Design a protein around this ligand. Structure first.
Ligand SMILES: [Mg+2]
Ligand SMILES: [Mg+2]
Ligand SMILES: [Mg+2]
Ligand SMILES: [Mg+2]
Ligand SMILES: [Mg+2]
Ligand SMILES: [Mg+2]
Ligand SMILES: [Mg+2]
Ligand SMILES: [Mg+2]
Ligand SMILES: [Mg+2]
Ligand SMILES: [Mg+2]
Ligand SMILES: [Mg+2]
Ligand SMILES: [Mg+2]
Ligand SMILES: [Mg+2]
Ligand SMILES: [Mg+2]
Ligand SMILES: [Mg+2]
Ligand SMILES: [Mg+2]
Ligand SMILES: [Mg+2]
Ligand SMILES: [Mg+2]
Lengths: 205, 203, 97, 117
RNA sequence: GCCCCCGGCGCGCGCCCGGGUCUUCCCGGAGUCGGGUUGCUUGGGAAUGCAGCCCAAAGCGGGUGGUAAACUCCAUCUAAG
RNA sequence: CGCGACCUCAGAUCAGACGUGGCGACCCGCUGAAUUUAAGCAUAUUAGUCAGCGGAGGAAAAGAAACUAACCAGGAUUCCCUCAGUAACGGCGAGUGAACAGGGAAGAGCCCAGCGCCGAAUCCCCGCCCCGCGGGGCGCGGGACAUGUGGCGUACGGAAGA
C-alpha cells in the first residue's frame, strides 16, 4: 500500500465507528435552551445576582500556571472564620463554602479576608421583619441593578507589578551569575552523598 | 456500650471462644434450606451500622451460596474459537459471592428492597450470608422521613443493577489514578464517550 | 538572592503554623478503647500462628520468627509491628511472674 | 453502669442465643469488681420488666429497707462467682460421648478387668 | 371577549434559644484492608481494577505519593455504612 | 401428670397491602464470540463490541475525597474545548491508547451506626370522636413493635457537657 514520500498515518478507524458518532446538529438548539435557561434563572430569583455565590481567589497549582490567579470554589473555613461569620450563616449571605481547602500562606489567607471585608461592605441585604439587624435602608432602588455579571467583583483582575526604574548598582552586576544556578543545582544533587562521605570519613577513625 | 464489645469480639474471629461459635453456626445453617427467614439479625451490631433499625418493615433472609468460580457452559469444553478462548475450567466471574447472594434473595422476594448484606459463615463448600430487606410499602418506612427514599421507584431491585455496597465494590468505582477505567458513571459509559467520535458542525 | 532550583527551592513565602485538621486524630489509642482490647485479650487468647510464634520467639530464632510472621501476615512493615506487639505479651508473661 | 461502677448487682440471662452478647460481661465485672450472677430464663428476666426477653438487670439504687437485703446476697454471690474466677477461667465442658458408646467402653472395662482378674 | 387549571401578598394550626471564649472529658464502619497466587480486564508497566482460593491485620494506626526491597524524612487523605 | 413464660417454627379462602408482565431507541449489572487485519498464522487485532440474560427511569449512572499534586499549590460528580494520536502498551509488529492540570457549561449540599446523656421521652394498628369541601389528616382509650436498644440533640468541617 504505501508509496512515494509521505508520512506514516495511523488513524483509529478499524473499530466500526459509524454506530457511535455524536453529531452536533443540536448545537444551536441547546444554545437557545441555555440562554433561556439562564434567563429563566434570571427572573426567578429576585435582587440576588445570577452567578451569585462569590468565589475565592486561588493561584493555579503547577509550575506552569502558578504565576496567574483563578476564582476557586469556596472560601476557606479558616479564612471565613477570620471574618468571624458562621458556616451556614454564610451560604445564606451568598458566599461559597469549601471544607477541603487549607491555608498555607498568610499572604493568600489575608487577601481573601480583604475580599470578604469587601463583599460584606458590598452587601445590601433585605430582612423578613425590619427589626434592623444587619439590614438596609431605602437603598438606591435595590442599588441601581438587581443582577451582576460574571462574578460580583470581576474575580480575575490579575495584579501587575511595576518596579519602574532604578539605577544599577555595584556588586550586583559584579556577583550575580548563570553559575549560581549551576552551582546551586549541583549543590542540591550532592547533598545526600556529601553528607555521607564526610560522615564515614569521621566514622572511620 | 456493648456494641463496641460485640465488634471487638467478632473482630478476632480465630480465637477459641469464637471459633467454636463460628463452627457450630456453620453447622447450624447447612442443614436448613436455601432461603429462609432469620427472625432477627445474628450480628446485631453489623446489621445496625448498615441500616437496620429494629422495628417493623425489616426482614433478614439468611442466604447460602456455593463457593468456587464458574465453569463455562460450553458442552464438553468445545468452545469453538481461537486458542485464547479455551478458558473452560478457570474463569472466575467478575462479581463477588456476596453480590450473588444479594441477587437470589431480592428476586425471590420482589416485594422487598435490598439494602446491604454481611458475612455469617463458610466451612468447606458453602458460604452463608444474611441480607437485610426493606419493605417499601409499610407505614413504618413510608413515614419516618430518614428512610423515605427507598420507596421512590428508581431504587427498584438495587442489587441487580449493582448499587449496594456489594455492588459498588463490584464495578470498581473510586477516584484518582487507580480508577481511570470508569471515568463517568460506569466503564460502559466510559467506553461510550472515550470512543465516540465527535463529528462537529465546524470541524 | 532567590532561586528557582536548588536546595531552597521556589518562592520564599510565609508559613501559616496553625491548628491541624481533626481527621488526623483518627487511629489514636483513646483510653476508653485501650480498656476494650486489653479486656478482650484476656477473654479470647491468641491465634495459632501467634502462639507458635511465641514458642518460636523463645528458643528458635528471632529472625525465623519474623520470617514466620511475614509469611502469615502481609508485609515486612507489619511483621515488625506484630513481633513488637507480641514481645510485650511475652515480657508481661515472664516479668510479671 | 458497670464501666463507671454505677451499679451493684448484675443479673445475666441464660439463653441469649447470640452468645457474643455475654462473654465480655463476666470478665468486665471481674476487672471492675461489680458482682454478677448467671441466672436462668431470659423470659424470667422479662417478667420483671414487662417485655419478652431482658438479658440483663443491674441493681443500681437500693432502697432504705433493702441494702441489708443486698449485702446478705452479695456475700453469697461473691462466694461462688467472683472469688473463683481463676477456676471459671478453665472449665472446658463437653467432650461427653453418647451413652451407647459409653456403655460400650464400660463393658470394655469389665473384660479388661477380666484380664486383670 | 367566553370557559378550565396553576405558580407570586394575607384571618386560624404545627413548632422555637441561638452566637463567642476558656476548663473538662468524648471521638468511629473486619473474613474487611493488606500479602500470597490464579484467571480476566486495562495504556498501567516488579501485577490499574475486578474475582476465586489460601494466609490474614492495626491503632503515633491505615491507604496513597506511577520500577521491585529495606532505612527513613515529609507531603496528603480517612477506606470496608 | 398439669399449667404458664419465651424461643425456634410451621397452617390458613384470616384482616389489609406488595411483586410478577409489557416496550426496550437512551441508561445500568453480568455473559461474551467470530468474520475481518497482520498480506500466512496462534499472542495481539476484530472487542470487552453484535448476539444471550437480567433491572429501572424520564432520565439513568455518578456524588460530597482512604483525591490531584510535588509548587506561591488545588479542592464532590457529570459534560464540552484542549492536553493527544501524547506518556504508556504491543510476535515493541500490525495496531491500541489514557489522566492531572488550563479554559467553559452547571453549581447544593448532607445524614446514620458507633461514643455517651434524656426513666422507650419513639413507633404501628385498632377502638371512639374531632375537621371544611374535591379527599386525606390532627386531639382521647386499648392491643402490639420494642431493651438482642425505636426517638431527641450527634458526624470527623470536630462534637458534647459545665
Ligand atoms: Mg503504490
Ligand atoms: Mg469490523
Ligand atoms: Mg418482626
Ligand atoms: Mg477541516
Ligand atoms: Mg487487552
Ligand atoms: Mg495514618
Ligand atoms: Mg500499615
Ligand atoms: Mg517512599
Ligand atoms: Mg469524611
Ligand atoms: Mg488477504
Ligand atoms: Mg478485548
Ligand atoms: Mg447485547
Ligand atoms: Mg420487568
Ligand atoms: Mg416509567
Ligand atoms: Mg438528571
Ligand atoms: Mg452513593
Ligand atoms: Mg499534538
Ligand atoms: Mg482494546
Amino acid at each position: 500500500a504505501p508509496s512515494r514520500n509521505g508520512m506514516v498515518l495511523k488513524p483509529h478507524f478499524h473499530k466500526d465507528w459509524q454506530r457511535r458518532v455524536a453529531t452536533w446538529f443540536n448545537q444551536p438548539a441547546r444554545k437557545i435552551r441555555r440562554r433561556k435557561a439562564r434567563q429563566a434563572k434570571a427572573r426567578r430569583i429576585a435582587p440576588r445576582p445570577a452567578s451569585g455565590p462569590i468565589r475565592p481567589i486561588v493561584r493555579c497549582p503547577t509550575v506552569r500556571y502558578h504565576t496567574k490567579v483563578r476564582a476557586g470554589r469556596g472560601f476557606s473555613l479558616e479564612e471565613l472564620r477570620v471574618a468571624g461569620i458562621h458556616k451556614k450563616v454564610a451560604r445564606t449571605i451568598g458566599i461559597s463554602v469549601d471544607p477541603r481547602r487549607r491555608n498555607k500562606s498568610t499572604e493568600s489567607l489575608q487577601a481573601n479576608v480583604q475580599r470578604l471585608k469587601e463583599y460584606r461592605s458590598k452587601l445590601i441585604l433585605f430582612p423578613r421583619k425590619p427589626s434592623a439587624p444587619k439590614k438596609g435602608d431605602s437603598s438606591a432602588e435595590e442599588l441601581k441593578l438587581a443582577t451582576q455579571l460574571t462574578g460580583p467583583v470581576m474575580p480575575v483582575r490579575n495584579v501587575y507589578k511595576k518596579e519602574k526604574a532604578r539605577v544599577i548598582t555595584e556588586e550586583e552586576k559584579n556577583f550575580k551569575a548563570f553559575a549560581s544556578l549551576r552551582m546551586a543545582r549541583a549543590n542540591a544533587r550532592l547533598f545526600g552523598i556529601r553528607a555521607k562521605r564526610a560522615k564515614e570519613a569521621a566514622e572511620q577513625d | 456500650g456493648a456494641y463496641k464489645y460485640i465488634q471487638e469480639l467478632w473482630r478476632k474471629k480465630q480465637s477459641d471462644v469464637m471459633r467454636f461459635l463460628l463452627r457450630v453456626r456453620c453447622w447450624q445453617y447447612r442443614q436448613l434450606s436455601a432461603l429462609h427467614r432469620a427472625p432477627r439479625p445474628t450480628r446485631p451490631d453489623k446489621a445496625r451500622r448498615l441500616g437496620y433499625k429494629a422495628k417493623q418493615g425489616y426482614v433478614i433472609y439468611r442466604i447460602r451460596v456455593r463457593r468456587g468460580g464458574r465453569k463455562r457452559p460450553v458442552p464438553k469444553g468445545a468452545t469453538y474459537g481461537k486458542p485464547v478462548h479455551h478458558g473452560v475450567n478457570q474463569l472466575k466471574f467478575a462479581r463477588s459471592l456476596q453480590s450473588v447472594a444479594e441477587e437470589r434473595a431480592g428476586r425471590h422476594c420482589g416485594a422487598l428492597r435490598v439494602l446491604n448484606s454481611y458475612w455469617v459463615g463458610e466451612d468447606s463448600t458453602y458460604k452463608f450470608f444474611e441480607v437485610i430487606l426493606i419493605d417499601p410499602f409499610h407505614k413504618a418506612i413510608r413515614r419516618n422521613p430518614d428512610t423515605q427514599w427507598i420507596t421512590k421507584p428508581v431504587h427498584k431491585h438495587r442489587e441487580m443493577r449493582g448499587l449496594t455496597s456489594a455492588g459498588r465494590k463490584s464495578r470498581g468505582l473510586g477516584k484518582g489514578h487507580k480508577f481511570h477505567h470508569t471515568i463517568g458513571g460506569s466503564r460502559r459509559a466510559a467506553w461510550r464517550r472515550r470512543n465516540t467520535l465527535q463529528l462537529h458542525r465546524y470541524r | 538572592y532567590p532561586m528557582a532550583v536548588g536546595l531552597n527551592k521556589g518562592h520564599k513565602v510565609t508559613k501559616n503554623v496553625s491548628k491541624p485538621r481533626h481527621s488526623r486524630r483518627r487511629g489514636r489509642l483513646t483510653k476508653h478503647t485501650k480498656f476494650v482490647r486489653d479486656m478482650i485479650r484476656e477473654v479470647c487468647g491468641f491465634a495459632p500462628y501467634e502462639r507458635r510464634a511465641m514458642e518460636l520467639l523463645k528458643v528458635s530464632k528471632d529472625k525465623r520468627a519474623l520470617k514466620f510472621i511475614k509469611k502469615r501476615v502481609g508485609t515486612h512493615i507489619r511483621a515488625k509491628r506484630k513481633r513488637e506487639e507480641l514481645s510485650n505479651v511475652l515480657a508481661a508473661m515472664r516479668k510479671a511472674a | 453502669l458497670v464501666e463507671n461502677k454505677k451499679a451493684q448487682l448484675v443479673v445475666i440471662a441464660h439463653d441469649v442465643d447470640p452468645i457474643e452478647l455475654v462473654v465480655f460481661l463476666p470478665a468486665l465485672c471481674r476487672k471492675m469488681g461489680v458482682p454478677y450472677c448467671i441466672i436462668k430464663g431470659k423470659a424470667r428476666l422479662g417478667r420483671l420488666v414487662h417485655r419478652k426477653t431482658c438479658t440483663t438487670v443491674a441493681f443500681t439504687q437500693v432502697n432504705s429497707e433493702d441494702k441489708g437485703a443486698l449485702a446478705k446476697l452479695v456475700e453469697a454471690i461473691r462466694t461462688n462467682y467472683n472469688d473463683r474466677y481463676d477456676e471459671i477461667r478453665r472449665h472446658w465442658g463437653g467432650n461427653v460421648l453418647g451413652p451407647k458408646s459409653v456403655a460400650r467402653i464400660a463393658k470394655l472395662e469389665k473384660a479388661k478387668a477380666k484380664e486383670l482378674a
